[PDB]
Design a binder for these strands. Sequence first.
RNA 1: CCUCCUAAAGAGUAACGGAGGAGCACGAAGGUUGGCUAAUCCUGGUCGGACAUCAGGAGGUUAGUGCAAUGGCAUAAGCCAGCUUGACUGCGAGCGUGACGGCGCGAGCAGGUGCGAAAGCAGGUCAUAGUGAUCCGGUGGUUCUGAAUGGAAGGGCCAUC
RNA 2: CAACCCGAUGCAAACUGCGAAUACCGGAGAAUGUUAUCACGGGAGACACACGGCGGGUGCUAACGUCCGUC
RNA 3: GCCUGGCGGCCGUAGCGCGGUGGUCCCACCUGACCCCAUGCCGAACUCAGAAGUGAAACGCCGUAGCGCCGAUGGUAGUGUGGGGUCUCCCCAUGCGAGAGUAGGGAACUGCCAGGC
Lengths: 116, 50, 178, 136, 79
Amino acid sequence: DKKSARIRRATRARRKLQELGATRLVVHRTPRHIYAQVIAPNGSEVLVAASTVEKAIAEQLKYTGNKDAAAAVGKAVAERALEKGIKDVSFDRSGFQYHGRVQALADAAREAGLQF
Amino acid sequence: GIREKIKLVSSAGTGHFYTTTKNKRTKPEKLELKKFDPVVRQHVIYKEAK
Amino acid sequence: AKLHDYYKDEVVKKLMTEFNYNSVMQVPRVEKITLNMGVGEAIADKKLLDNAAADLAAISGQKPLITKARKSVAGFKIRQGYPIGCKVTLRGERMWEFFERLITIAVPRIRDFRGLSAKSFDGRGNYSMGVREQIIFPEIDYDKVDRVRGLDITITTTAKSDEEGRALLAAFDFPFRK
Amino acid sequence: MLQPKRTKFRKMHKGRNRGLAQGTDVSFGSFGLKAVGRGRLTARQIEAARRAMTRAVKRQGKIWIRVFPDKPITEKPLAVRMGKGKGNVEYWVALIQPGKVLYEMDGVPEELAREAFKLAAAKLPIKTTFVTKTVM
Amino acid sequence: GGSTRNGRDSEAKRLGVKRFGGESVLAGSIIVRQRGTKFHAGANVGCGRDHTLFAKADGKVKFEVKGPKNRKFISIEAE
RNA sequence: CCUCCUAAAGAGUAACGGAGGAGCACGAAGGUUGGCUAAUCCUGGUCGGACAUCAGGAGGUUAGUGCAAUGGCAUAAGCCAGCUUGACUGCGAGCGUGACGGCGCGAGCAGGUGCGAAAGCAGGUCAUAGUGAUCCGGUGGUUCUGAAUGGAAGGGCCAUC
RNA sequence: CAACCCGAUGCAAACUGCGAAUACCGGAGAAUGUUAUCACGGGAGACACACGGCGGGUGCUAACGUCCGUC
RNA sequence: GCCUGGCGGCCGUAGCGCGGUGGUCCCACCUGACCCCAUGCCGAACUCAGAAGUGAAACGCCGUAGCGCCGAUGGUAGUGUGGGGUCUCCCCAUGCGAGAGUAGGGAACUGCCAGGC
Ligand SMILES: [Mg+2]
Ligand SMILES: [Mg+2]
Ligand SMILES: [Mg+2]
Ligand SMILES: [Mg+2]
Ligand SMILES: [Mg+2]
Ligand SMILES: [Mg+2]
Ligand SMILES: [Mg+2]
C-alpha cells in the first residue's frame, strides 16, 4: 500500500528520535489537508497541534494543503507550541520528502520561533 | 599478500605521513585523499600511493 | 487523448450496462501497455541491442529501459548483470496515442492476420501479445534496418478479471477473431 | 539391508536409551509386535524378522515396520591401538525401547499372525508381545 | 582422520544479569554476533562493533521483551 | 588462529574425539543521506529454450550477506544512487578477558572533518580468523642528549620498515 | 516409477515453533559460624593421582581401559 | 457517546479467509501537470496545482470459526536431596514438575490530540 511503504520509509527516524527521547514535531500530509502535532518524548501525549481541518485556520485559507496552507499551519504550530513553552524540538518529516508543503510549515515554524 | 604497503605524505610541507596499503596491480593510479596531520592542526590533501 | 475520449465516451456506458457495474469505477480501465522486445544473446555483439533499443524507441517515444539480467542462472549465459532488454511501459497520453498507433495502422498492417487470438486471459484483463516481427511501423526510413525484431505488448487493464477483460478493449475495434 | 540413503553426519555419537517409546498403540495395520524390552535392532535383524514374518502370511495381507536403523554405530578392527579417530561405521542399529511397536500386520486372521510374529520375534534380541488394535 | 582444531574462549555472555549496581558503563551482555540475542535499549545502548550490549549511565538493569516480534532488549533503570 | 558439537540451560574443559575453515579481500565492498526489498511457483506474452526479458497472482526473512561455521539482520547488517575521506589526531569515565606479555568493548572531552533541512551519524567493513614478542638495524621528523667548548657521529623520543 | 502438497508415524551431539530440576549472578532478612572473607607481604610444597556415585566422548554402554565435568 | 484521522501502549484471544456495510466531514482513490520535485523508461512511485467523479480498489467498522492463535484440570516425562534394586537401566520418600494431547477460550483491548454529528 502506498501508505504502507510510506510508514516503513520513516520508521527508522521514528525510532532514532525515540532513542534520543526528544519532543518531536510530527507532520502528516494528505491530498486535501496538512497536519502538525507536537508529541512528547513518551510519544503518548500530545502537547500542541495546529492543522488545516481546524475551522479557525482553514477559515482564512484559500485551499487546505496548498503549501501556503501547509505553512500558516506550521507557524500556528509554533505560535501555540511556545505559549505552551515548548521551544526547540525535532522535526519528523514522517515518510514524506522534506521538499514542498513539508519543507514549509517546517521552516514556516522554524522562522516562526521553533528551534531545530 | 600482493597488497603492497603505501604511505600517504602530507601535501603541506610538514613531514607527517599516513600509512595504508593498496593493490598496485588492479588500480594503477596513486591514491590521493586528504586527512588531518596534528602538526598543521588542520585537514589537508595527502598524496603518493604508487 | 483521442482514443482516450472514446473510453469515457461511448465506451464505459456500454461496459456499464454490460454488467450493470455498481459504480463508474467498477469499469475496467485500460492501464498502460508495456512492450519489452527480448534482446537475446547480446553477449555476441552488445551492439545490435543498443539499436534494438533505438528501435523500441522508434514506436514509443519514451526512452527504452535496457533491462539487465537477474538470477544469473542461465545455461544461455547471464552473469547476474549484463544487458538483455528494453521494456518501456506506456503512460496515459502515450498509452492511448500508441493505442492509436496500432489496432488501426499496425495490427492492420498485417503480414497474414486471419484472426488475432482472443486468448490471453489471466485474472485482471491482463492481455499480452508478441508481434513476432517489427511490423515496420513508422520507424525511420525502414528499409536498411536490422534482422527481424519483434517484441511484446501487454495491456494490464484494471479489469476485475479476464471475465471482463475481453469485454473492454473490445469497446474499440480490437482485431481478435470469431 | 536397510539404511538412511543420506546423512548430514557420518558418525552418530553413542548416548543411551531412556525408556518409554512413542509409537505405542498400533496406528496402521491391526495387530503388530510390541517391545516389552529395551535394546537395539541391528537392522540386519528387522529383515531377518520381516522376511520370516512375511513368509507365513505368504502374500496376503499388509505388513508394517514402525522402526528404523538410522543410527551408525562403528567398530574398530582387530589389531589396532585405541585413539586413532573413531572407527568406521560397520553396521546400522535401530534404537528401540519398551513400547515401540516393531511391526504391524493387518490383512490376515488373528491366528495367521499371532503365529507369524511369534515366529518373527524369535530372530529379534529384545523380547516382545502380540498386540490387538485398541479401539480408543 | 584429518579432524581437530577449534577456536578458543571468546567468553561472550551476560556479565550483568538482572538489576545490578550497573557502573557508569559496565559490560552487561557480551555475547558477540548477537544483534538480536539481546538488543540495545533505554539508558543503555551502545551496541559496540562486536554487538556488545554497552550499558550507559549507571544503574539497575532491566532485561525486557517488546515490539518487533518478541525481541529481548536490555535497558537500565536508575536505582 | 577462527566456527559448531562433545560441554552436564552463567564462564570455563580432555582425547591421535566428530566436522569445516584462515595466513586474505575492499579507496570502495569505507562514511553519510535519499530511496528500495528477495527465493520459488502459477497463468499470460515474438524470437524465449525447464530456466534469459515483460505482465499479473500466489508466496513471505524458503533470498541476500566478498570467503568457513555459528549467532544476527526489514529500523535491515541485504540493494540502488548522490555527495564524500570518521579507515581522522590527542585522550578516555568504566568494563570484559587473561598467570603474565597482552587482547577486546567503550560513552564522553579537545582540535579539526564529511553527509543531512534537522535530531543526528561516522575513530573503517554484520560480528567473531586473515598473524610474529625481543633484539639488531634501515628510513623520516625533532634544536631531548651530545665525554674540554661549538658543532658532528652516535644515543633518546614520535612515526615507520 | 515418483518430486512437491495433505493426512497419519518415528529419529537427531553438530534440528528447535516448546522447555524444566537446578546450577550460577544480584538484592533483602534472621540465626549460627573461635571473621570462615578480601588485600599486602615472609616461607612452601605441588604440577605422575587412584578408586566409587552421577553426566559424557572413546572403546564392545569390554577392561582394576582411556580422556573431560562434578561430589 | 458514535464515526474518522494522527501518535502511540501492548504484539496473533491482536493475524488471515469468508460474507456485509461506510463517503465533500475524514480518508482515500480521483482531475490537471509547463512547472517545484521525480522516472537508470513511466506524474506508477516521488511532487505540485486542484475541479468534476466513486466508495470499485485500499482503508475502517459489523458478523462468521474455515485456519492461525491462546489454552486449563488430570495423568505422563525429567529432576535436586535421602535411600534402594541393579550388567549398559530403574524403583521408593520428598520438593520441583514439563512437552504434547484433551476441555475449553477466541473475530483484541487501551491512552493522548484533532475533526464531524
Ligand atoms: Mg556454558
Ligand atoms: Mg565478515
Ligand atoms: Mg551448567
Ligand atoms: Mg608437568
Ligand atoms: Mg599431569
Ligand atoms: Mg584426572
Ligand atoms: Mg582408571
